[PDB]
Scaffold this active site. Structure first.
Site, PDB file in Angstrom:
ATOM      1  N   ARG E  96      20.483  26.448  24.751  1.00  0.00           N
ATOM      2  CA  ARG E  96      21.306  27.035  25.803  1.00  0.00           C
ATOM      3  C   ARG E  96      22.410  27.982  25.324  1.00  0.00           C
ATOM      4  O   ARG E  96      22.608  29.045  25.908  1.00  0.00           O
ATOM      5  CB  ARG E  96      21.909  25.921  26.659  1.00  0.00           C
ATOM      6  N   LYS E 131      38.407  45.519  29.296  1.00  0.00           N
ATOM      7  CA  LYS E 131      37.970  44.672  30.399  1.00  0.00           C
ATOM      8  C   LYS E 131      36.781  43.866  29.887  1.00  0.00           C
ATOM      9  O   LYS E 131      35.658  44.010  30.372  1.00  0.00           O
ATOM     10  CB  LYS E 131      37.546  45.524  31.598  1.00  0.00           C
ATOM     11  N   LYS E 163      49.660  54.026  30.022  1.00  0.00           N
ATOM     12  CA  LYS E 163      49.006  53.879  31.313  1.00  0.00           C
ATOM     13  C   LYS E 163      49.963  54.134  32.468  1.00  0.00           C
ATOM     14  O   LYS E 163      51.167  54.301  32.269  1.00  0.00           O
ATOM     15  CB  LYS E 163      48.377  52.486  31.421  1.00  0.00           C
ATOM     16  N   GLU E 193      47.259  58.443  30.011  1.00  0.00           N
ATOM     17  CA  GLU E 193      46.390  58.655  31.157  1.00  0.00           C
ATOM     18  C   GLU E 193      47.181  59.395  32.232  1.00  0.00           C
ATOM     19  O   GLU E 193      48.339  59.074  32.498  1.00  0.00           O
ATOM     20  CB  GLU E 193      45.859  57.321  31.694  1.00  0.00           C
ATOM     21  N   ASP E 214      42.177  60.008  34.658  1.00  0.00           N
ATOM     22  CA  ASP E 214      41.939  58.921  35.607  1.00  0.00           C
ATOM     23  C   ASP E 214      41.552  59.363  37.021  1.00  0.00           C
ATOM     24  O   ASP E 214      42.363  59.937  37.751  1.00  0.00           O
ATOM     25  CB  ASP E 214      43.175  58.021  35.680  1.00  0.00           C
TER      26      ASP E 214
END
Lengths: 276, 277, 277, 276, 277, 277
Positions: E96, E131, E163, E193, E214
């Site tokens: 598994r 992410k 950011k 960005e 962006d």
């Protein structure tokens, strides 16, 4: 398995610290030797492979040779095993190895006594959660060596409604019903009952397993009769050899014994170096 | 405290709790409050009260553990030693481990106190040994202290103790002692275990700092004390019982090491009583 | 070895390697083989050879570390102390940590050997202290042993050493010693640091087992040895230099504790020479 | 941050074990006291907050009061800080706290000497990877306190083609090209060069940063002239105060110094208890 | 991998095995050793073979893993990816975990070449993001590389990326880029960005080494490359679908970071079937 | 959670922060505290709020987390899920980890009620599987519960489930079920997966407590419930899509375990926006 290797290294470090200062003083670095583990009283041996690992961790050059089988009953004065290799290594692992062997053998010895007491009946001996913190897996193993079976490992793998849950639910019936309503489909719902009336509640609520908590012998026999083999019955609470035997003869299917791990005297064993 | 206990308690709670207390999650409401008391079912010495407090806190920080007696206090049967109130789930989750530890440590402290009292009237002191539970040594040695006993070395790294196996490996008591005295760390005393009055003489003459009398019959013990005449501290050990420890003490030894304190102390009978619900 | 070193080495390699040696992954072919030798750029005592071997193995188990001299061996400048062959990436990945440790420990062993030789002809022995690098104590004490020195206690848990701060806290040397002797663990010797001949007398009379002479001028050191007359071992300490350690030894002390061994030992100049590519 | 808390607890345990047996013998459990940390020689203080944490971990009831600012230069005999609270706690954390304060201050002191030597120039002082295993974050901090700047933390966050990479690639040009061909777009490609010819290769291959490894002063000046400010230049290799200063006056932008952490003598400090 | 993958694998294996694989202990003999085969019940790119092999080795060192296809190779339904031989209990134990990884990593390697092949023909290269799955970043970033993609920074510690929250925390693209360029490590490039070309300009002259676009409308996406003339790398960000990605590559961007490569990538259907017994 | 979630979160935070959030240290003041808001840029079910709150608390204990919607509640685009206040550096530091979790767990909670609502009207209940993300099982199994689903076993240690590999390892559905029923813990139910109704019968009389139907054609799926008359729970398994799942529920099964709930579930688009500064 379950991290035993890591646990043994930690327990060895507990005792060894920077090193065995006494042995470094009087035992040459390359001196090879042999020691004998002797039983100082009669009982059952459990944990031979664990002791082997302890000595191996102390020094991989050591060789452990059992002179009895794991789970064998020995008499006082019996040679349990022989260990050979660097003497420093043997002396470094000695105490920890013995602490574990004596403890596990103690559990297996009392378990074996209970199991033998139930000979002639279909009843099986179970353990409990009254285990030494950090040693549960090892102690549950000792029970198996003694001839007993294991109940759940913890609160995460078994459903057991105890008196406190019954009190919280407002009764055996309510507890069994709240449980069966959202319990994992792969687990059985066991409930502890302390009276014949609660037994009836449990049977009426649909319990899969019923634990008779501290039932007098007369009530236990009546419980077996009433259940008529419809559901498995487990007996527990202040169990002694005599009580487990009686419960078994009365007809219960299981007897869980806290004493196996909560009050089992260690088996007296020692390790003696063979004179160079 | 030294450290690591926090990590050990978390691991032991994990051992029992795993992904969670399934039974309680099934029938006990998340907000249902619980109220319980820890009762002494027999008289004895309390030890580990603060340890039990921490275990309950690890199960659920909202739980409130309130000690009703002092740590190390001897209580009579029926004494409520602590009260615990908060989320019932958290109480049920920590109960088993908390009591297991409380019972174990209290049991050690209780037996130790019994040995200490058995030595009353003499100058002898009770010592522990390395016959401890793997992973619990710091806590068990702490329990011995709570009971009134003294600690011998923690392990093999902080004390020179020539045991029978070292004596056999070196070819004799005098041989082992002379070797150790010649190279022993200067901040440690050289102790050696002896099994006869002849071995005792070897130890004394080779310069041992400490001598441990291993399972000496009473007659021999008395003779050993007389001979030594206070030249070096004497530690008696071997199949100790309260009677034997007292006899050794009255014989005149300075220390009595007792393996039973941590090797075979019966757990103290304590139980968690949930008063509500 | 005690244990934990394995875990420590992994952590230290992680400290430097993180997700990976980006530079080497960019320009060094995965299968490109490397061949290098560790060279002693100056003469000194080698220590940590097996530690360096383990670090390279942790970077890449295919790497082969071959010692060319014995652990603890003093080598002359230009001596190739070890050969390493295997995937160049693995060699470059373990180089920095391996050498950092090898240089550090060798440096300690080298200085320690210098102090040991300075005491030649006398019965005095060199001792280390607790002025060690956080997290490196076991390894540094090991290096002291490789150099020929002896280890004093590992920490505060395995030796009774009444320092100036304890003397000040107890209100005097005799006061601190009497208190310690009354309750000290029986397997440990009671040592106390003294700063004058008057404090020395207090220590002797209160029953100290060990006396550490703190920064005594030569004249006083000689007088201290004469007075004590071998009644108890004397340990000299305080701003040690090879000259001072030798003077103390010739004065007659039994031990000379040197903080410099682990507190200010210069690293031994060792370098990794990649012969191919 | 980066697990400092856990590291301090581990280092405290290294020294404390089961407990401070000496202090337990002569210092009452509830006896409060005060101690002074004194500088035994002149230098720069770094790690005051670390020492505070050490004493706090030993006993949270302790209070640490600095009498100098972090990064301040002090003279011999100066009171650095005062610690108050349970005496046992102070005596338990003393050695570890001092070991750290002395080491970090030692690094900050040598760094400050290098930084001051470069006053008047635009050059900045950088550290290297020649740090104490397990103490890199703390030592890099000490460099900042001293006035220096930090180069990459390890092999994972910066591209630096060293002599060995050049050898593996078959030349500076090939190394710079293999690197710029697959290097993270957020990182600059720095390459070490050991001669004016390699410098030319580096500039021709497109290096973003160039490290002049062990260049004689005359060659360093020539390198600065040739580059004409087109790319930042870093100088390193057997750096001394005099060499860093010369390199800076010659016009390099950065000087990385291994000595800051590889051969910085600890600052001599002591902790003295105030007589009760 | 030298990044502590072993410790991770052991921990993940324990998450699944606990006290032991009860089922297999009940019906599978301890001495019975069998052979199994990994099958790809789907088409895609294989990634994680060596990871699976280490899972089995950790489950039972006596297991023999034999990869039948090279890592990263594209497979079709029914393809035998690998065969494992040895104690059947060990195989069923690691089954598994080995598959959850192989499937998960293969899924990412599969979906990544999707993009690599998608915007092929151009110069644009696919990049990942942060992410990722907590605790699986290293392995997932590896999957991308196997699928033909490239890695962006591993965390907030190895790269400078201003950011939106940073910009507003500072007060504009201009200053934020200045504050960063003012004290940024000399070996790092400053990336920011932007959302508007008033911001792309406010950054290009602020001295930025990299620019992140962006949710750029494509009239600006292919304008921006034009106004930059390829002076500083261009990276397109936002809802980068297979179309909006290949588009950016068509527009001429240098890099396209797809956060969907690990934030919404289905596992590659794989299975382990025992062929003996 | 008492299951060591804290240690996991700390480790995951370190995976992202390392030496420190360089970017924020360069442009964000240490004394500047701001306020942020979590936004759901999509429609779905929210799960993991308390997890996110503990991430911020661990990043910077001085952070104030304020959930605006109850856990498990269904949200729409633009909904303010929660607001965090305090040192802006701490918020930017935990941002990415907090979201990766909230998004991931919310995605599972969202997709789960999909099924719960899907096969609604019937008695069938949705169950998860062991095809979870390594190291995230506990959290993912929690997500299912939040979405209205239920948990199957947590590993191979808490449940008996005879799979195909077991059956063939034994030699048939019959014996395998017998070997298990012969020595299985008395508190556990024996479950076995079958592929043919010759096997469903071979199990129903072998004494099985649970039966798993693997890739059953629906003429058999709704037959099986009929031939069982609801004597032993029925669990449908295989490629359980939203249709093949609601179908099984229509057929009358008791449980439907969907391995796609965690093996191919896209994250719920969420974001954290600084609103001050």
């Amino acid at each position: 398995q379950g991290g035993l290797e890591e646990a043994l290294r930690a327990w060895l470090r507990e005792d060894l610290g920077q090193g065995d200062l006494t042995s470094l003083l009087v035992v040459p670095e390359d001196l090879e030797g042999e020691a004998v583990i002797l039983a100082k009283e009669g009982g059952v041996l459990a944990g031979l492979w664990v002791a082997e690992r302890v000595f191996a961790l102390a020094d991989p050059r050591t060789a452990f040779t059992p002179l009895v089988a794991e789970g064998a009953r020995v008499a006082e004065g019996t040679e349990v095993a022989r260990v050979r290799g660097p003497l420093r290594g043997i002396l470094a692992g000695e105490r920890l190895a013995l602490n574990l062997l004596q403890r596990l053998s103690g559990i297996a010895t009392l378990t074996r006594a209970y199991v033998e007491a139930l000979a002639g009946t279909k009843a099986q001996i179970l353990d409990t959660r009254k285990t030494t913190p950090g040693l549960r897996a090892l102690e549950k193993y000792a029970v198996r060596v003694g001839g007993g079976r294991n109940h759940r490992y913890g609160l995460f793998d078994g459903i057991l409604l105890k008196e406190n849950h019954v009190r919280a639910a407002g009764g055996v019936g309510e507890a069994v019903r709240r449980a069966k309503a959202r319990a994992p489909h792969y687990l059985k719902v066991e409930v502890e009952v302390r009276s014949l009336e609660e037994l009836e509640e449990a049977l009426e609520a649909g319990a899969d397993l019923i634990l008779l908590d501290n039932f007098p012998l007369e009530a236990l026999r009546e419980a077996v009769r009433r259940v008529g083999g419809r559901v498995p019955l487990e007996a527990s609470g202040n169990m002694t050899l005599e009580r487990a035997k009686a419960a078994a003869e009365a007809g219960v299917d299981y007897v869980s014994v806290g004493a196996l791990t909560h009050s089992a005297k260690a088996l007296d064993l020692s390790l003696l170096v063979v004179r160079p």
